[PDB]
Design a protein around this nucleic acid. Sequence first.
DNA 1: TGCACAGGATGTATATATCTGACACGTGCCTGGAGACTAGGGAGTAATCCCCTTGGCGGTTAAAACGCGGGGGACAGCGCGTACGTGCGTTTAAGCGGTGCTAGAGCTGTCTACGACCAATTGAGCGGCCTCGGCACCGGGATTCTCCAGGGCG
Length: 49
Amino acid sequence: RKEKRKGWNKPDAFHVCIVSYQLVVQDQHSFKRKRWQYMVLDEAHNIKN
DNA sequence: TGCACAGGATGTATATATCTGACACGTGCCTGGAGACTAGGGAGTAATCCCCTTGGCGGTTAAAACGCGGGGGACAGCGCGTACGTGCGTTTAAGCGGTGCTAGAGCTGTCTACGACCAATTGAGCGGCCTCGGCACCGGGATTCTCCAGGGCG
């Protein structure tokens, strides 16, 4: 993940990113820094709580 | 003449009177033993609330666990030599017996500052709160920093 995040910030290396549900719990501090346009949730019956 | 002896002239442990030191016994003045009054500090209870558990499925991650290569560092063997161990004679100085002192250690009245004990005020310090600027974590990039392969050199 560090190797994925070293081409991350300054330029645009991707038009979309694929991140698992549970990884945003640990990496929430890193993912909250970058601005985003669309964040979509699959099978929302998880987050329902 | 060469020799044994009878008694004095010195030693020497032996037995007796004598000199410290420590245990043992008989007192009387600062201690304990005990009796009564006060009272606030300790034993006991009625909510309480508040964080701390109960029991176990799964999914996933970061940390724990195992496995091999080998590199270098622990470690055994062994020779050296000088640095203390051991043994003499020679000296300086403490141990100890005894002395003349004193100046500071040590027990006792005076009173007098001066701190113990107790009402009245409050304000400075403690419970409650709610923010934002310093802090937490990480990318970007430059910088250093060590690892490995010649090769010019033995």
